[PDB]
Amino acid sequence: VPWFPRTIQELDRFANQILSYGAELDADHPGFKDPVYRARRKQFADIAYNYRHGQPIPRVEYMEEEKKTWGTVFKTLKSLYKTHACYEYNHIFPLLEKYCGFHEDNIPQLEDVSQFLQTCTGFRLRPVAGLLSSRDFLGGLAFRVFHCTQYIRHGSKPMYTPEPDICHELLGHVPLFSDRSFAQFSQEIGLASLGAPDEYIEKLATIYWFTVEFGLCKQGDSIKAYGAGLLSSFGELQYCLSEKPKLLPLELEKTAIQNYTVTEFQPLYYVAESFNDAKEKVRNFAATIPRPFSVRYDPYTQRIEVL
Amino acid sequence: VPWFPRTIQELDRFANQILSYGAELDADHPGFKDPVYRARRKQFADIAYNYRHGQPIPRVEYMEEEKKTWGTVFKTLKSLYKTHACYEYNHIFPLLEKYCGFHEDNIPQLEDVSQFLQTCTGFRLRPVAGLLSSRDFLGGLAFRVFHCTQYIRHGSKPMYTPEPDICHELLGHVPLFSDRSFAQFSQEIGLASLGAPDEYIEKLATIYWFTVEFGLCKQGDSIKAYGAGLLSSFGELQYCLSEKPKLLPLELEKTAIQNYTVTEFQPLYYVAESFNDAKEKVRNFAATIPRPFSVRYDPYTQRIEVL
Numbered sequence: 001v002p003w004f005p006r007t008i009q010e011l012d013r014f015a016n017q018i019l020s021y022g023a024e025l026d027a028d029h030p031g032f033k034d035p036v037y038r039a040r041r042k043q044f045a046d047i048a049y050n051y052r053h054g055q056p057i058p059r060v061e062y063m064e065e066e067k068k069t070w071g072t073v074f075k076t077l078k079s080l081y082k083t084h085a086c087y088e089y090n091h092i093f094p095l096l097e098k099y100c101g102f103h104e105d106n107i108p109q110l111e112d113v114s115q116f117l118q119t120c121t122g123f124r125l126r127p128v129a130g131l132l133s134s135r136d137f138l139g140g141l142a143f144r145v146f147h148c149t150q151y152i153r154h155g156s157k158p159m160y161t162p163e164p165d166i167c168h169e170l171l172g173h174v175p176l177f178s179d180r181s182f183a184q185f186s187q188e189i190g191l192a193s194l195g196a197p198d199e200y201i202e203k204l205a206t207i208y209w210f211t212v213e214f215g216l217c218k219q220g221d222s223i224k225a226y227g228a229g230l231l232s233s234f235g236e237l238q239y240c241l242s243e244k245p246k247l248l249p250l251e252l253e254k255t256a257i258q259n260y261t262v263t264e265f266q267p268l269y270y271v272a273e274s275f276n277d278a279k280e281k282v283r284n285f286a287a288t289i290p291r292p293f294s295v296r297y298d299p300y301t302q303r304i305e306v307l
Numbered sequence: 308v309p310w311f312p313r314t315i316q317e318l319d320r321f322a323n324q325i326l327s328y329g330a331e332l333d334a335d336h337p338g339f340k341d342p343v344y345r346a347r348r349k350q351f352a353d354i355a356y357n358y359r360h361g362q363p364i365p366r367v368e369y370m371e372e373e374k375k376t377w378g379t380v381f382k383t384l385k386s387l388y389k390t391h392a393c394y395e396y397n398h399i400f401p402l403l404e405k406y407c408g409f410h411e412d413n414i415p416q417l418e419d420v421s422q423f424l425q426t427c428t429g430f431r432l433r434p435v436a437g438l439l440s441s442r443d444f445l446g447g448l449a450f451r452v453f454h455c456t457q458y459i460r461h462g463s464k465p466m467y468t469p470e471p472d473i474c475h476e477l478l479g480h481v482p483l484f485s486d487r488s489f490a491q492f493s494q495e496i497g498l499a500s501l502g503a504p505d506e507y508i509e510k511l512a513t514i515y516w517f518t519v520e521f522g523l524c525k526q527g528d529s530i531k532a533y534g535a536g537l538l539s540s541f542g543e544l545q546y547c548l549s550e551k552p553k554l555l556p557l558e559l560e561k562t563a564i565q566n567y568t569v570t571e572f573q574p575l576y577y578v579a580e581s582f583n584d585a586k587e588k589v590r591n592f593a594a595t596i597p598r599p600f601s602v603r604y605d606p607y608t609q610r611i612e613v614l
């Protein structure tokens with residue numbers, strides 16, 4: 001049985017376990033030839049590397065160049081939310097704009113966003129240097145902890161990023177983590193991953209992809225997007241609700257083994273009846289995972305109870 | 308419907324609602340003629356009066372006279388716990404002695420005790436000036452918050468106190484609040500009191516008296532004490548498990564209306580099958596309380612959800 005954190009503080013062991021050679025080092029990366037960008041990324045990586053549970057997330061003064069990139073992404077995407085984003089998203093966005101500083105001329109500080117999420121569902125953020133294993137990233141969700149990037153994409157291509165960056169985290173993920181039902185749903189995924197075999201972790205990663213990242217949900221007699229990858233993608237967000245993509249009901253037995261690529265728009269999306277239904281489906285799927293025990297999270301003591 | 312806190316911070320409104328003329332002012336009080344004691348009590352009252360949710364509980368340097376009083380109470384009572392106190396009590400006491408400084412020559416600081424309880428069940432302490440109404444005192448339990456006194460009884464009579472004092476809170480209450488089952492049970496009482504009519508509040512106060520204060524519980528084929536009033540009373544603790552008092556099964560419909568006095572040993576005690584059973588009985592009793600709504604506590608956001 002693979003090791004897993006029993007306390008929220010134990011998530012600290014995750015920092016010393018990431019891909020040390022990030023994407024910013026790749027020749028095809030938008031900022032590859034930018035030494036200033038290289039150092040800025042390293043600066044953000046060090047903040048995450050030195051962060052420890054409990055401490056407030058270090059505030060950072062973003063440069064004008066970075067705020068411009070943010071403004072571009074903010075302005076373009078926001079024009080689609082009212083008609084394409086699920087109710088949960090639109091209901092909370094006005095609140096984020098007023099209490100977290102969500103504006104095109106300002107990049108929200110993770111500390112303020114984390115406090116806001118805590119007040120909403122107890123979800124909190126932890127700055128992350130780079131890509132974590134699926135096991136570690138999903139494990140955090142069990143404690144309602146989202147490993148969040150703080151750096152921003154390179155300014156040369158504001159409408160594109162080969163990795164998650166702050167625009168993605170804040171405009172795509174955060175709004176949904178402010179919803180109780182979604183919070184419980186995402187947490188159910190995290191709980192299912194604790195001590196799960198590597199093979200089932202990959203299955204949960206795939207389920208996560210078709211829900212938290214590119215999921216669509218029913219809303220009355222309509223269908224709306226709730227996936228963070230869709231909500232942070234101007235092109236795919238409009239595409240996902242057109243007649244081009246194929247839509248199928250969310251079915252974990254099938255979804256969990258569905259292949260996909262992160263290079264182009266998804267040809268297929270899974271539609272969740274609701275966040276509560278999706279959560280129940282995850283719970284049922286979790287029961288099929290070979291684990292010599294059962295897990296539960298106790299928010300009172302922030303510990304995982306192993307039975 | 309009487310007002311009640313919706314957030315743990317709203318408990319702050321309680322400080323401005325206590326009996327401003329405490330027992331230390333009564334002519335028959337052990338320290339009535341002691342001006343030094345009078346001022347010491349006022350000093351402790353001011354700390355509670357200025358305390359606000361979130362802040363750490365101010366540490367206080369106790370005088371040698373006070374530590375002596377504590378040592379006397381500690382030494383005498385402790386000799387009875389192993390044989391008279393319930394398992395939950397004895398299981399946690401060794402831990403309190405090692406991490407909270409529970410020794411006869413040292414009075415534990417409430418801040419350390421609160422941190423300890425939080426790690427155990429999420430229960431926390433809040434210093435309280437004097438006697439709170441039953442509604443306010445029980446309301447706090449809904450948030451797993453115990454209003455705790457910080458002052459100590461007068462040194463002239465270490466084996467006696469006409470009110471709750473720190474020896475009572477720490478040696479009687481605290482150990483039980485470190486148990487998950489008891490924690491949930493006591494909280495169930497607090498939840499039942501939220502917005503309850505004055506008459507049912509008195510009923511919950513009576514139930515509390517026969518459980519949290521002077522309750523006995525079954526333990527295997529034996530019976531042990533768990534009530535804080537018994538655990539902090541050398542005389543009654545031995546008495547409660549002898550053949551003199553009358554014992555009856557815990558039955559809220561009867562217990563809730565049973566009369567009692569706080570001047571002499573209880574002639575009758577109610578025996579709980581267990582803390583979980585008692586909690587279920589409270590829940591059922593709570594359903595009989597005329598309330599145009601249902602309540603639930605969300606530890607994730609520390610708010611009461613009203614349905």
Ligand SMILES: C[C@H](O)[C@H](O)C1=Nc2c(nc(N)[nH]c2=O)NC1
Pocket residue numbers: 128130131132133134135137138147148149164205208209
């Ligand atoms: C969720 C699934 O495990 C997916 O492959 C991952 N996403 C992320 C990750 N790590 C970070 N920091 N952020 C992500 O969004 N590691 C793995």
Ligand SMILES: C[C@H](O)[C@H](O)C1=Nc2c(nc(N)[nH]c2=O)NC1
Pocket residue numbers: 435437438439440441442444445454455456471512515516
């Ligand atoms: C529990 C029942 O409401 C009982 O009358 C009370 N106990 C207490 C109280 N207030 C304090 N501060 N401490 C207690 O132990 N107010 C009322």
Ligand SMILES: [Fe+3]
Pocket residue numbers: 164168173213228229
């Ligand atoms: Fe993402």
Ligand SMILES: [Fe+3]
Pocket residue numbers: 471475480520535536
């Ligand atoms: Fe008491």
